[PDB]
Write a protein that binds this ligand. Structure first.
Ligand SMILES: O=P(O)(O)OC[C@H]1O[C@H](OP(=O)(O)OP(=O)(O)O)[C@H](O)[C@@H]1O
Ligand SMILES: O=P(O)(O)OC[C@H]1O[C@H](OP(=O)(O)OP(=O)(O)O)[C@H](O)[C@@H]1O
Ligand SMILES: Oc1ncnc2cn[nH]c12
Ligand SMILES: Oc1ncnc2cn[nH]c12
Ligand SMILES: [Mg+2]
Ligand SMILES: [Mg+2]
Ligand SMILES: [Mg+2]
Ligand SMILES: [Mn+2]
Lengths: 186, 196
C-alpha cells in the first residue's frame, strides 16, 4: 500500500464492527414486525461507495434474521455551486415505494452531510413507517449542515480515506481495508 | 444454516468464496498482457444491478488480492421484475457514467439463463468500441438459452431450478442470504398466488 500513509481499519476489524452495528439494528427493530415481501427493512444503498458496505451489512443483518429489501440509488450533481442544500439529481431511485415502510439509508461516509441531509428529508417526505441512516465512517467535525446518523461504525478525523468502497478519483474502491491516502499521492 | 424456504443449498458461502478466488486468479493471469494500471488503465467492471451487487463486492476484492486495478461502473437493468420468468424484454434503468470507448471492460453478472439480458448488454456495449469486452457470470444455467451466449468466465453451472441468495432474488426477496439455495416452488407459488 505505497499510496497510503496509514491503515485505519483492516478487513477483519471492519467485519467485526459491522456485525456489532447489525446486531444493534436488529435489536432496534425486534418489535416492528419485519417480514419478507410485506414488511422488509428497506436498505437504500447510496451508490457508488456504499456498494461494499451494503453487501457485507445485509449479510450480517441476515445473520440476525432481519428480512431486507435492497434498493440502490444513483445521484448526480446539478452543476458547480448551484445548490447548498445538497440538492442532487436522481438518476436511479428506489424500485418500490417506501411509503409505510421501515427504511434505512446506507452510506459509506458522512462529512459535510449536505447530500445525505437532502436525501434524508426527501425520503422522509415520502412517509415511510420509519427512516434512519447507517454510515460506515463519520467525520463528525466536517459538517456544513447539522446532521446525525443513527448508526455509525466508526468516527474518524479529517483525513482522506480510501478503500472498502471509498475512492479517490474512482481509484482504490476495491481495497479490503480502509487507509489514508498519502497527500503526496493526492 | 437452515432455510425453511429452501429445497436445498447449492453453494455455501465458503464454496463461493473459494470459487471466486480461482476465477479472480484466472482473470488476473488473462489480463496480465494488458498492463492494467490505476488511473490510466484500470479494468472497468460493469456491475449489473441489482443482482450483481454482492458478487461484485466480493469479486473486486479478490481481484485486488491479485493486484488487478479496477474502476467500478454500476448500471441497472430489469427483466424478471417480481416474477420467475424472463419478461422477454430487457429494460436499461441506468447506464454507465463514463464512456467505455477504448477501455478494457468486464461485465459482472450474477446469473445467465435465457441470455436475453447479456445479449442485450453485449450488443449495446460492443457498438461503443471498448478495447475489449468480456463477461464473468457467477452462475450459468447453460440450458436456459433463448439466444446464444457464452461468458468468458463462469464460477458455476447450475441446473434449471430457481436459485436465490448471494444477490439473487425472487420478487426482491432473499438477496441477502450468504449461500446460494434452491427456492421451494410451494414458496414462490404461494407468493405468486398472493400477488395474482
Ligand atoms: O457528507 P459529504 O461531504 O457529502 O461526503 C460523503 C459523500 O461523498 C462521497 O460520494 P461521492 O460524491 O464521492 O460519490 P461516490 O460514492 O460515487 O464516490 C461518499 O461516497 C459519500 O456519499
Ligand atoms: O439470462 P436472463 O434470462 O436474461 O436472466 C438473467 C438476468 O435476470 C436476472 O435479473 P432481473 O431481471 O431479475 O433483475 P435484478 O438483477 O434486479 O434482480 C438476473 O440477475 C440476470 O440479470
Ligand atoms: O475521506 C474521504 N474519502 C473518500 N470520499 C470522501 C468523501 N468525503 N470524504 C471522503
Ligand atoms: O434461478 C434464478 N434466480 C434469480 N434470477 C434468475 C433469473 N433467471 N433465472 C433465475
Ligand atoms: Mg457516495
Ligand atoms: Mg467518491
Ligand atoms: Mg431478479
Ligand atoms: Mn440482474
Amino acid at each position: 500500500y505505497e499510496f497510503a500513509e496509514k491503515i485505519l481499519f483492516t478487513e477483519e476489524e471492519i467485519r467485526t464492527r459491522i456485525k456489532e452495528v447489525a446486531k444493534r439494528i436488529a435489536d432496534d427493530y425486534k418489535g416492528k414486525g419485519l417480514r419478507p415481501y410485506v414488511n422488509p427493512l428497506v436498505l437504500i444503498s447510496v451508490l457508488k461507495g456504499s456498494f461494499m458496505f451494503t453487501a457485507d451489512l445485509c449479510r450480517a443483518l441476515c445473520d440476525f434474521n432481519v428480512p431486507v429489501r435492497m434498493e440502490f440509488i444513483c445521484v448526480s450533481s446539478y452543476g458547480e455551486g448551484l445548490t447548498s442544500s445538497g440538492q442532487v439529481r436522481m438518476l436511479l431511485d428506489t424500485r418500490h415505494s417506501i411509503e409505510g415502510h421501515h427504511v434505512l439509508i446506507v452510506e459509506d461516509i458522512v462529512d459535510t452531510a449536505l447530500t445525505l441531509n437532502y436525501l434524508y428529508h426527501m425520503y422522509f417526505t415520502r412517509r415511510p413507517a420509519s427512516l434512519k441512516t447507517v454510515v460506515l465512517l463519520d467525520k463528525r467535525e466536517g459538517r456544513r449542515v447539522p446532521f446525525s446518523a443513527d448508526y455509525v461504525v466508526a468516527n474518524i478525523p479529517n483525513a482522506f480515506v480510501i478503500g472498502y468502497g471509498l475512492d479517490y478519483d474512482d481509484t482504490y474502491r476495491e481495497l479490503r481495508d480502509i487507509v489514508v491516502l498519502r497527500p503526496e499521492v493526492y
